[PDB]
Coordinates of C-alpha atoms (C1' of nucleotides) in Angstrom, one line a residue:
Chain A
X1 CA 159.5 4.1 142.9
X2 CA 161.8 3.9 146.2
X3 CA 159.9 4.8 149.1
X4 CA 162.5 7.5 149.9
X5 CA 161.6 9.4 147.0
X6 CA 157.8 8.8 148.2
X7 CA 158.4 9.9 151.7
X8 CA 160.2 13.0 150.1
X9 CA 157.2 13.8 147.5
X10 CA 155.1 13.4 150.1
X11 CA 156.7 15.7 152.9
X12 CA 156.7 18.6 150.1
X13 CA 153.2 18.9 149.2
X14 CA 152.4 18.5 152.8
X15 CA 154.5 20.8 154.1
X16 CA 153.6 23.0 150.5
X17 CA 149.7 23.2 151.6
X18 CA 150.8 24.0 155.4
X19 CA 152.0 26.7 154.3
X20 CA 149.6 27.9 152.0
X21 CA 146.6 27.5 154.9
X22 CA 148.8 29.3 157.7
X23 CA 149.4 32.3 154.6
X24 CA 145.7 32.4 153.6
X25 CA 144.7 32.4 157.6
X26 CA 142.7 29.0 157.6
X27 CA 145.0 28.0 160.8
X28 CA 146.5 30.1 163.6
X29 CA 150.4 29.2 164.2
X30 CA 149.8 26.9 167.1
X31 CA 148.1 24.5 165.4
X32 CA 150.5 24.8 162.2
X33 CA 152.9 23.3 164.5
X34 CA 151.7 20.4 165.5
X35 CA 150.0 19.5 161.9
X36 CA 153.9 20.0 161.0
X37 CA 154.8 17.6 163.2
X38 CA 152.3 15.1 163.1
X39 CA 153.5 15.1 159.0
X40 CA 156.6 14.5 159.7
X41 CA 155.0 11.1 161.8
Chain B
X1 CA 181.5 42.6 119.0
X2 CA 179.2 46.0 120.3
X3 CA 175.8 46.9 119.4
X4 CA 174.9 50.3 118.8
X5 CA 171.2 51.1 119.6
X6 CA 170.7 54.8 118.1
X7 CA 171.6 56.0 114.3
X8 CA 173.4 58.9 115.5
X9 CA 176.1 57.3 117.3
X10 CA 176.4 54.8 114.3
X11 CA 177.3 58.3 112.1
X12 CA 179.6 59.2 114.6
X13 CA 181.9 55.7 114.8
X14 CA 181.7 56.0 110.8
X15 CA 182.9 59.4 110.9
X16 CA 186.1 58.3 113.0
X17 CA 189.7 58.2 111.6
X18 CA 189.8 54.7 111.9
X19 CA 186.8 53.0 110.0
X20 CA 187.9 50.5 107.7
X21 CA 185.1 48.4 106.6
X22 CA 181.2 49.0 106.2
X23 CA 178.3 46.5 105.5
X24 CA 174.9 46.6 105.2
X25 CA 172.9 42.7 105.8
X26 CA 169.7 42.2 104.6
X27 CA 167.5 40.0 106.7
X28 CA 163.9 39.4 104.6
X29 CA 162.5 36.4 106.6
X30 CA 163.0 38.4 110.1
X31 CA 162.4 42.3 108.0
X32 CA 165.2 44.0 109.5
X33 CA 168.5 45.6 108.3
X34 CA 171.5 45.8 109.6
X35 CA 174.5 48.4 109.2
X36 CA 178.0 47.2 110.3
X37 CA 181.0 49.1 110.7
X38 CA 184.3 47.9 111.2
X39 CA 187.0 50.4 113.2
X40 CA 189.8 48.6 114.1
X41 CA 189.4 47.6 118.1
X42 CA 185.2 46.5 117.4
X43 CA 182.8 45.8 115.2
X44 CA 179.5 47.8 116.0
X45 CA 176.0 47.0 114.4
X46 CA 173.1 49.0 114.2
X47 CA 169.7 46.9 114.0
X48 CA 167.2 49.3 112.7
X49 CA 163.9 47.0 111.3
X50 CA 163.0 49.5 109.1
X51 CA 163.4 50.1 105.3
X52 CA 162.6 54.0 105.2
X53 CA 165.5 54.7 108.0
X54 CA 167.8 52.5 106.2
X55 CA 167.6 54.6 102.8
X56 CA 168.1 57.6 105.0
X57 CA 171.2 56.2 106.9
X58 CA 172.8 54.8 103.5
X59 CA 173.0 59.0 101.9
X60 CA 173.9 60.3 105.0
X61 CA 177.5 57.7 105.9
X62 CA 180.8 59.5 104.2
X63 CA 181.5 58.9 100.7
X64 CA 184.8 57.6 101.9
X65 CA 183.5 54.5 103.1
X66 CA 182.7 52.7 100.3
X67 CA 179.0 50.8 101.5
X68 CA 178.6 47.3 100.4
X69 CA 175.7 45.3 100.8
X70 CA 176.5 41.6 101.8
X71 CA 175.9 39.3 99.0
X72 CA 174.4 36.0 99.5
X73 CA 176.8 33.0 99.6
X74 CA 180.4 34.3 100.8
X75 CA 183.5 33.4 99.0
Chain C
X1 CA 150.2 70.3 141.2
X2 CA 149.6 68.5 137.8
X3 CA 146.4 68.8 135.4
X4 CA 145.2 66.0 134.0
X5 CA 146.2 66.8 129.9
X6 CA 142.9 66.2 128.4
X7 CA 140.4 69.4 127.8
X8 CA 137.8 67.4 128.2
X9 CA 138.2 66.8 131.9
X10 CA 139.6 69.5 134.2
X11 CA 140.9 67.4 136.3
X12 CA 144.0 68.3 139.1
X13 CA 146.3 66.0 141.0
X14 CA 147.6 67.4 144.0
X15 CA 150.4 66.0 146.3
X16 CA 149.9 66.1 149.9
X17 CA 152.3 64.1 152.2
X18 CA 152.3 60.3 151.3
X19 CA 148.5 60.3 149.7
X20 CA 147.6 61.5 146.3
X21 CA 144.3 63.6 146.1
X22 CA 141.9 64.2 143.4
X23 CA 140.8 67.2 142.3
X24 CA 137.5 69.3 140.5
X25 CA 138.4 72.7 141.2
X26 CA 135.8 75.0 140.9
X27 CA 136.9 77.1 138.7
X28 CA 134.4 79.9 136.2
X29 CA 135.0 76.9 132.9
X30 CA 133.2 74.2 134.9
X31 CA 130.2 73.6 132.7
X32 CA 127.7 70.7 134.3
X33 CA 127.9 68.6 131.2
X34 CA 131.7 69.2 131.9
X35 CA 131.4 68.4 135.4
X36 CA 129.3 65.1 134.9
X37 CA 132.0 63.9 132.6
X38 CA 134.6 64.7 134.9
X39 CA 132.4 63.1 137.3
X40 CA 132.1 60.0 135.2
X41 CA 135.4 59.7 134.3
X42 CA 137.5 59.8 137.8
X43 CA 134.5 57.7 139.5
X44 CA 134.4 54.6 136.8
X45 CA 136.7 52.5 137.9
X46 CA 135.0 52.2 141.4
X47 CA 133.9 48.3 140.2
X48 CA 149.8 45.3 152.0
X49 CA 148.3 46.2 148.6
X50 CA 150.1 49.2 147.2
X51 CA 148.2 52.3 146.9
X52 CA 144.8 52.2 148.1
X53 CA 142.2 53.8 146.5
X54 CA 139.7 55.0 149.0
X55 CA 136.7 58.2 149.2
X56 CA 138.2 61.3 151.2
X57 CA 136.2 62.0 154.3
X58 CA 132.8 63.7 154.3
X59 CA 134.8 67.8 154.6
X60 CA 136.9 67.0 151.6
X61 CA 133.6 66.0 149.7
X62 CA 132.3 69.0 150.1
X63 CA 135.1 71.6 149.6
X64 CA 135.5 69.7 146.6
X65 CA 138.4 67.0 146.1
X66 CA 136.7 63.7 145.3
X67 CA 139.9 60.6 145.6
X68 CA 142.8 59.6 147.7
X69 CA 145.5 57.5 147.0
X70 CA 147.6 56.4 150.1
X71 CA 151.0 54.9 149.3
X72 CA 154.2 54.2 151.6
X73 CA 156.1 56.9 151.4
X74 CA 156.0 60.4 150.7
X75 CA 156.1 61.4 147.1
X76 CA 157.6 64.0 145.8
X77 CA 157.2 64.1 141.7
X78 CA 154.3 63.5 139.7
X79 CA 153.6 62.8 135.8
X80 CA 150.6 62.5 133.7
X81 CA 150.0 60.1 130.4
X82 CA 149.1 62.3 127.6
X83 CA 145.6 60.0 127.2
X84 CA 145.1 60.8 130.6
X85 CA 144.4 57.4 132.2
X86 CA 147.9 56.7 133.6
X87 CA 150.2 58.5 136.2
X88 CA 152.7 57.6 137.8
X89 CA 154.1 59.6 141.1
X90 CA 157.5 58.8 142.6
X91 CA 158.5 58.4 146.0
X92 CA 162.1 59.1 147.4
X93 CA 162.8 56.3 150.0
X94 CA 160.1 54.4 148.6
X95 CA 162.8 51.6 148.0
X96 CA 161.5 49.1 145.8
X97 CA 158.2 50.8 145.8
X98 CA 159.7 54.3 145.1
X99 CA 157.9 54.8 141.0
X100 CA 154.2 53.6 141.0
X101 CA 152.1 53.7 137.8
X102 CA 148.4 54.0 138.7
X103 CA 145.3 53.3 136.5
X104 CA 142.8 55.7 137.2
X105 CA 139.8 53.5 134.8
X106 CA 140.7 50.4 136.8
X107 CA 142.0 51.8 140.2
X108 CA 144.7 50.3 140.0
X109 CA 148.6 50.4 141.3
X110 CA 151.1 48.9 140.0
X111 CA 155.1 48.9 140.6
X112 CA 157.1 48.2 137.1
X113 CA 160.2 48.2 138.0
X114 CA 161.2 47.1 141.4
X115 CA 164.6 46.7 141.2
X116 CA 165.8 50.4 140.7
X117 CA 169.9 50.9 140.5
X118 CA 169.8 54.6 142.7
X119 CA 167.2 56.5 144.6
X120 CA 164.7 57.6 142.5
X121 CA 163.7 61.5 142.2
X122 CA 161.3 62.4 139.3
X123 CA 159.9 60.4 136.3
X124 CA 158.2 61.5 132.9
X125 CA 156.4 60.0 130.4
X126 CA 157.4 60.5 126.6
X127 CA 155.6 63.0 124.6
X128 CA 155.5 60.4 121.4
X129 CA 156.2 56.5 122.0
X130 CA 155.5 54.6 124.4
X131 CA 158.1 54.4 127.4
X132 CA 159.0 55.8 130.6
X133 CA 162.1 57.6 131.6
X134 CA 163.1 57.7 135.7
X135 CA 165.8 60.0 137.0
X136 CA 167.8 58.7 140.1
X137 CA 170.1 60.8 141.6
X138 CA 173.1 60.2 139.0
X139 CA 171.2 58.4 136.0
X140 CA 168.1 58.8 133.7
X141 CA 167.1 55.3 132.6
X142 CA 164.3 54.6 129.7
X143 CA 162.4 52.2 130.0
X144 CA 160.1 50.5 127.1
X145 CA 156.8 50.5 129.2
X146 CA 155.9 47.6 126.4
X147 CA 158.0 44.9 127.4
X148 CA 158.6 46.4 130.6
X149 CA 162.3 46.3 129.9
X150 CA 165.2 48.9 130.3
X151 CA 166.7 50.3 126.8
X152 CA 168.5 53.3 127.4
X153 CA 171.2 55.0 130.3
X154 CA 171.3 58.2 130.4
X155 CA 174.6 59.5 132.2
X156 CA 174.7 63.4 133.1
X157 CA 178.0 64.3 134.9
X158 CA 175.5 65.8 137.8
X159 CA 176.5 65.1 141.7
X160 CA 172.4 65.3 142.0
X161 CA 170.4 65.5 139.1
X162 CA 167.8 68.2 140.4
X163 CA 165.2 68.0 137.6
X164 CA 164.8 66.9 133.6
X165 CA 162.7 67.4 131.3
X166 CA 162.2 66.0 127.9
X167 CA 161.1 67.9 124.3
X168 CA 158.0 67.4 122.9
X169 CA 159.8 65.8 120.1
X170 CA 161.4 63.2 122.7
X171 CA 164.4 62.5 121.1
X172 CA 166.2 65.8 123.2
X173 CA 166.4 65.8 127.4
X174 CA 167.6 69.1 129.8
X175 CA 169.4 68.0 133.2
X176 CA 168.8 70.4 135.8
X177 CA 171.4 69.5 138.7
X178 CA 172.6 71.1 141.8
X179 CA 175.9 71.7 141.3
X180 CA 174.6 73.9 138.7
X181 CA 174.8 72.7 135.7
X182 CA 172.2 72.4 133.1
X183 CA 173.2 69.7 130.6
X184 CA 171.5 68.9 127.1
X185 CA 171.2 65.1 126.0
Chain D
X1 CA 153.8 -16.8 89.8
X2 CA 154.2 -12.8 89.1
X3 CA 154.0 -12.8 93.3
X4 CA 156.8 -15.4 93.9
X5 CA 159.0 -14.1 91.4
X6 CA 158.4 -10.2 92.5
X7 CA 159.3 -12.1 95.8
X8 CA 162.8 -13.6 94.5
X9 CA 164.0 -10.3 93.2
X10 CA 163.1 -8.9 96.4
X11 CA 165.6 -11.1 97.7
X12 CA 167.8 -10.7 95.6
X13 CA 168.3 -6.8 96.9
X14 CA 167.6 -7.5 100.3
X15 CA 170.5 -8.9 102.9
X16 CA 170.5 -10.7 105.8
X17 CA 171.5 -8.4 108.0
X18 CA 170.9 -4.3 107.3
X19 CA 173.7 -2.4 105.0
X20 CA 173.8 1.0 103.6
X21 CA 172.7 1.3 100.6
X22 CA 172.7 3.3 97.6
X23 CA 169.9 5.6 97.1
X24 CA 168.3 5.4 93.5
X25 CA 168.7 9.2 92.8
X26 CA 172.5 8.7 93.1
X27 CA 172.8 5.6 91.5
X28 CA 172.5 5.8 87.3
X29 CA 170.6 3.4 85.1
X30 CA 171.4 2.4 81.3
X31 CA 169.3 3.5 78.7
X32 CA 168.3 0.2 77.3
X33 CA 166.7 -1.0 80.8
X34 CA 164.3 1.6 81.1
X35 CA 163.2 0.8 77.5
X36 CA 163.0 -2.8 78.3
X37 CA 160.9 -2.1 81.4
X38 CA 158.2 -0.5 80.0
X39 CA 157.8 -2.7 77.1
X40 CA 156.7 -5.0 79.7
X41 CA 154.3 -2.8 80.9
X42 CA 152.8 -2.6 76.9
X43 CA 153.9 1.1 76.9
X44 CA 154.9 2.8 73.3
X45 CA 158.7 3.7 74.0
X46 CA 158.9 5.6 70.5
X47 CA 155.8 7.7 71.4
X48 CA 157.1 9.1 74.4
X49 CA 160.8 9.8 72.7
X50 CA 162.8 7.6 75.3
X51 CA 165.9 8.9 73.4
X52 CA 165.3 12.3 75.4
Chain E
X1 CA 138.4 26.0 109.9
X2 CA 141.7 26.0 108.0
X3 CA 142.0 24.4 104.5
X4 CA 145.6 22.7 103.5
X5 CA 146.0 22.3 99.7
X6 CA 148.6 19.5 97.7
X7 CA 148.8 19.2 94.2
X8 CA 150.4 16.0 92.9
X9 CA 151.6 16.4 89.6
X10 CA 152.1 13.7 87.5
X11 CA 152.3 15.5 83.7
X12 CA 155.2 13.9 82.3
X13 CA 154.1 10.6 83.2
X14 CA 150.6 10.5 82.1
X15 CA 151.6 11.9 78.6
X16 CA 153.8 9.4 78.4
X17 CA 150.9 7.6 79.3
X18 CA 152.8 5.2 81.4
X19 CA 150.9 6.4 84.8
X20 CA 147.1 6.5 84.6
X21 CA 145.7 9.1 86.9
X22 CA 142.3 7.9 87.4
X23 CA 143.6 4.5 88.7
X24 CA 145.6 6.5 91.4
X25 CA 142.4 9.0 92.0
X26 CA 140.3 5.7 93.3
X27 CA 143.6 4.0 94.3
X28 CA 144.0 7.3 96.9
X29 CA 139.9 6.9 97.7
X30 CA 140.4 3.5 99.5
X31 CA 144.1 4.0 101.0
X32 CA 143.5 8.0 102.9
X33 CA 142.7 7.3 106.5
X34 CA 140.9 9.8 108.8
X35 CA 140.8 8.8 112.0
X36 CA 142.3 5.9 112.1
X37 CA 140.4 3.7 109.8
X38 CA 140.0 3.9 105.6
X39 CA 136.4 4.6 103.8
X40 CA 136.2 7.4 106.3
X41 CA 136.4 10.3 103.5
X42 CA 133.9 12.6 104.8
X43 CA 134.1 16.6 104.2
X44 CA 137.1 16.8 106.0
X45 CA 139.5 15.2 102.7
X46 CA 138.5 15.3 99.1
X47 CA 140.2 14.7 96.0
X48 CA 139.5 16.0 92.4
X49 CA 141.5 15.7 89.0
X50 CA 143.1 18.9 87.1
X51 CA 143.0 18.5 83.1
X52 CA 146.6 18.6 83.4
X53 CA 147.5 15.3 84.4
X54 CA 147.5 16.6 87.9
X55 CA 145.7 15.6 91.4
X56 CA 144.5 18.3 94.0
X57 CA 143.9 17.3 97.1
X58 CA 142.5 19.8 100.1
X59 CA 141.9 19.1 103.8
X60 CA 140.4 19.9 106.8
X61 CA 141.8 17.8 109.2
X62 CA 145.5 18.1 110.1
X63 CA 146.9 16.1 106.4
X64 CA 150.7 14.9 106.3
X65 CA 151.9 16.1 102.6
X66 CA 154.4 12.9 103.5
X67 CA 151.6 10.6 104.0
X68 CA 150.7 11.6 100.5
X69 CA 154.6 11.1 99.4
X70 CA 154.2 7.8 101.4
X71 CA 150.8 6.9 98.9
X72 CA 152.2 7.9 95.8
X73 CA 155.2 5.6 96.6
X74 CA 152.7 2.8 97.6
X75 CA 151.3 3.0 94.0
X76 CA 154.4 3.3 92.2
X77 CA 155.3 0.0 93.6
X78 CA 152.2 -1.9 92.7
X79 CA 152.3 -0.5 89.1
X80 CA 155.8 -1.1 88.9
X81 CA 157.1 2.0 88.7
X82 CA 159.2 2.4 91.9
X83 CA 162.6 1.8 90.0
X84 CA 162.1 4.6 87.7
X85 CA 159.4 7.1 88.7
X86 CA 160.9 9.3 91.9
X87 CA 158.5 11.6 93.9
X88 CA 160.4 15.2 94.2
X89 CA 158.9 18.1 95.7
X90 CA 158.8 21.9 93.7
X91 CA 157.3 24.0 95.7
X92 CA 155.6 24.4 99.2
X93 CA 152.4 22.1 98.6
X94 CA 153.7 20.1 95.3
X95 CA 155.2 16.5 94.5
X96 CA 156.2 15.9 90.6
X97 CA 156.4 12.5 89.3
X98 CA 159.5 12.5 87.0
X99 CA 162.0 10.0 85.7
X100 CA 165.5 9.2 87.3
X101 CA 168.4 10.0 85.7
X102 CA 169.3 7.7 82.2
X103 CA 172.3 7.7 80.6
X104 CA 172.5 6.5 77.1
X105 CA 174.2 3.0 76.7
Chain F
rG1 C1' 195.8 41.6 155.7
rG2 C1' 193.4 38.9 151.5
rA3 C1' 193.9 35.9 147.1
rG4 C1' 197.5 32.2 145.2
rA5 C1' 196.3 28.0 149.2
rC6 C1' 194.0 22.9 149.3
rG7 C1' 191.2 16.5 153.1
rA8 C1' 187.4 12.2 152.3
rC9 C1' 182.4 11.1 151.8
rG10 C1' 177.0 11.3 151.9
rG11 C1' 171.8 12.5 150.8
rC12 C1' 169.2 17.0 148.6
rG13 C1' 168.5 21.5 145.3
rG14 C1' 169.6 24.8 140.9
rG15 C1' 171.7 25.2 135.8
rG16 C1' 173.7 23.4 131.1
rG17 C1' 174.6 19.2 128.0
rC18 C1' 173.6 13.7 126.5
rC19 C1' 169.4 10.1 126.5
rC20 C1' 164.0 9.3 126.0
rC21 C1' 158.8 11.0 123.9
rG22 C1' 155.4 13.9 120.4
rG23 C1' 154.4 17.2 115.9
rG24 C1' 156.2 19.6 111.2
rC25 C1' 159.5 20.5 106.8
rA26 C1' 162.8 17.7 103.2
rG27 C1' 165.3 13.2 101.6
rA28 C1' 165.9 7.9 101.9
rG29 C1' 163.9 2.5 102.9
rU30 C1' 160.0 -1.8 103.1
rU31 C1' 155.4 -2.5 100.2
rC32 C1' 152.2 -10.3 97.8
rU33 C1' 149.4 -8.2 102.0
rC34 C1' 149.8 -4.9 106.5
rU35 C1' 152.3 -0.5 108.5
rU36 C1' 148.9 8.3 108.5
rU37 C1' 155.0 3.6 108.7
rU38 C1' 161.0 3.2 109.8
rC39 C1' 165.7 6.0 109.4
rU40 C1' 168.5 10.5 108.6
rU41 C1' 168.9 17.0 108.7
rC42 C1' 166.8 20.6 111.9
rU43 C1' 173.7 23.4 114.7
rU44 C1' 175.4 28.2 117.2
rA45 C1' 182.2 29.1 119.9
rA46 C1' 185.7 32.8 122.1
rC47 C1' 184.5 37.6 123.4
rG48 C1' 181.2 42.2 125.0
rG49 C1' 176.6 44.5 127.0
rU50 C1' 172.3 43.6 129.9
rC51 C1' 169.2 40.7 133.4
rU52 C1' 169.1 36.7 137.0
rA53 C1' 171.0 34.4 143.9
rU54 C1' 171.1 30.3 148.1
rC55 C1' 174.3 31.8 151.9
rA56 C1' 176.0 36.1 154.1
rC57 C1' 175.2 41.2 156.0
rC58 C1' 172.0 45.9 157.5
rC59 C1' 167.3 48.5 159.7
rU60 C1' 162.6 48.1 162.6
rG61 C1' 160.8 45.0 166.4
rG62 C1' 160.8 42.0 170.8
rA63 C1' 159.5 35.9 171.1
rA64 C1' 156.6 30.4 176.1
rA65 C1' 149.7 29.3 174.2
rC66 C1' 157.5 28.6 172.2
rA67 C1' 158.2 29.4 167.1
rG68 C1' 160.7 29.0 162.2
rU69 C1' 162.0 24.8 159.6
rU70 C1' 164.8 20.3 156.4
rU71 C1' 164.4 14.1 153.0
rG72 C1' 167.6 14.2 157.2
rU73 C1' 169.6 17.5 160.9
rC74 C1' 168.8 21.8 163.6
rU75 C1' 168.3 27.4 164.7
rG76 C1' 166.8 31.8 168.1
rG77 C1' 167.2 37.5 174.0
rA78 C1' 175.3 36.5 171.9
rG79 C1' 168.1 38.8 169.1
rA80 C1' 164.1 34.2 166.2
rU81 C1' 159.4 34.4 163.1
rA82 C1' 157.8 38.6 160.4

RNA sequence: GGAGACGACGGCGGGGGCCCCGGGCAGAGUUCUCUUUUCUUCUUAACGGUCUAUCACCCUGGAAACAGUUUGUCUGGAGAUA
């Protein structure tokens, strides 16, 4: 599979279960940010 | 083509000037019945799924119209 | 001020400001094997959520209310289920939380219908099948509690439909309005 | 022998490459063949009143 | 838990005596496969005769009534019959041997 | 004053069709041997009612320990997240 497609599977269900820890409280919004970040490195 | 939910407004549409045609479908393999008027601008059905309400509904439209079930294969 | 339809229970619903209280009035008819099942009955379902169930404080234990349900906004209508285990209470400005259906054996609220064409006023249950009817402030719509799915309109020619209610052989409705017109459907 | 010569008349039906075909239920067979067949398979055709 | 019944009727045939129905009762013994492999008749398929020149069959296990059109056309073909026996069915569960269509010559 | 009334392209998302895969019903085909096997049917228009939304817009509120966020870019005291 191209690895554009991967890189794009990949940033959803990262950016999916960010999400779903900052919502259920397991991280504060400071250090969502730079998890964000350091997925999109 | 309308649908007509209640038996009462079905009476009512039959009971206009204008109704030409009437016809009743049977439906065995889904059990309901259904009563379709023609008058002029729309054809309005009435889906009732029930044989007891049906017998009811067929002594109660005007003699005028004269009811015809649909027979199977069409000509 | 509702009763709870059941002889069995004696129970009243009263509605103060945004919370619903809970009532055993003491009244001369209150029998202690009728008190214990009215007991039983309101407490067995004790095993931003909307309306929460809580214990009033320890003055309005005593004097003789015995639940509170808090919701968003202040209600101004209440209906009971004939079986006695649902009712629903609406809430004008409520939005898309105005009608709530609560479950009094689970403790439980719920909002059916959330997206609600008008501002609601009063709801009733029907006295045979099962359904719901809501007034807004120009339409009665029917709703099939079943499928949870709309199946009638009802359309009075009222400005502001004040009140309705519906016969206890639920095919027949009376409109009460404020621009005074009582209308039969 | 009874294989190789069940094999001939199975080439003798069959094409090289696939045609349509006519299905046996459409297609209509004589009288005499079907008694011929079976006396063959050492089958009484008077018993069973081939002449329908 | 659930029980499917097929009835292969081949009445016409056997009184014509042209079809023997106990070759195809042990011909249908060796060729029904269960899971995957044949000799595997357990409980789950079994197969009895009817006086009338008729096979029942009744399973257990998720049973094609078109793998039993597909046997009764494999034994047709080894007795010869393929050319004028055809496989038809009735009704809901039941597959009639009967001639083709002859015309007189 | 609006609609009529409008350039080219790119990657992404939604929805319907076509293709692909599995089961079942019915018919057809191979069958020396093998193949619970191969193929075909399994459809649903205009119109009407009802339900369904990204953007956009409104109310509260006031944001740096900056935050929201896309595959990518970006957005916010000229009011963001919620």
């Amino acid at each position: 599979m191209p690895q554009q497609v991967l890189w794009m599977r990949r940033q959803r269900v990262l950016r999916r279960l960010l999400v779903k820890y900052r919502a259920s409280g397991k991280i504060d919004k400071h250090l969502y940010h730079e998890l964000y970040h350091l997925a999109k490195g | 083509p309308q649908e007509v939910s209640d038996i009462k407004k079905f009476i009512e549409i039959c009971r206009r000037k204008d109704a030409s045609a009437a016809r009743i479908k049977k439906n065995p393999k889904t059990q309901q019945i259904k009563f379709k008027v023609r008058c002029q601008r729309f054809l309005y059905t009435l889906v009732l799924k029930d044989s007891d309400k049906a017998e009811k509904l067929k002594q109660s439209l005007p003699p005028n119209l004269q009811i015809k079930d649909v027979p199977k294969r069409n000509k | 001020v509702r009763w709870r339809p059941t002889k069995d229970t004696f129970i009243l619903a009263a509605a103060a400001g945004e919370d619903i209280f809970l009532m055993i009035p003491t009244h001369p008819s209150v029998t202690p094997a009728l008190d214990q099942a009215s007991r039983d009955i309101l407490n067995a379902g004790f095993g931003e959520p909307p309306g929460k169930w809580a214990r009033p404080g320890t003055r309005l234990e005593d004097e003789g209310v015995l639940l509170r349900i808090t919701v968003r906004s202040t209600i101004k209508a209440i209906s009971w289920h004939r079986r006695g285990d649902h009712f629903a209470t609406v809430s004008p400005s409520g939005q898309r939380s105005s009608v709530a259906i609560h479950t009094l054996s689970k403790h439980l609220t719920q909002i059916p219908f959330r997206k609600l064409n008008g501002l609601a006023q009063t709801a009733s249950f029907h006295p045979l099948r099962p359904l719901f009817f809501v007034a807004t402030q120009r339409s009665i719509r029917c709703y099939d509690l079943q499928k949870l799915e709309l199946v009638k309109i009802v359309q009075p020619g009222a400005k502001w439909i004040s009140s309705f209610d519906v016969h206890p052989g639920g095919d027949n409705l009376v409109v009460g309005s404020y621009d005074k017109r009582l209308l039969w459907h | 022998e009874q294989h190789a010569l069940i094999r001939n008349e199975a080439k003798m039906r069959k094409s090289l490459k696939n045609r349509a075909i006519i299905p046996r239920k459409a297609v209509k067979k004589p009288l005499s063949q079907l008694e011929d067949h079976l006396d063959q398979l050492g089958v009484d055709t008077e018993a069973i009143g081939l002449r329908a | 838990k659930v029980t499917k019944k097929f009835i292969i009727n081949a009445s016409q045939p056997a009184s014509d005596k042209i079809f023997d129905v106990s070759a195809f009762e042990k011909f249908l013994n060796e060729r029904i496969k269960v899971d995957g492999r044949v000799g595997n008749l357990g409980d789950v398929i079994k197969i009895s005769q009817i006086g009338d020149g008729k096979v029942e069959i009744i399973a257990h296990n998720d049973l094609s009534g078109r793998y039993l059109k597909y046997l009764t056309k494999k034994f047709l073909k080894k007795m010869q019959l393929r050319d004028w026996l055809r496989v038809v069915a009735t009704s809901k569960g039941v597959y009639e041997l009967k001639f083709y269509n002859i015309v007189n010559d």
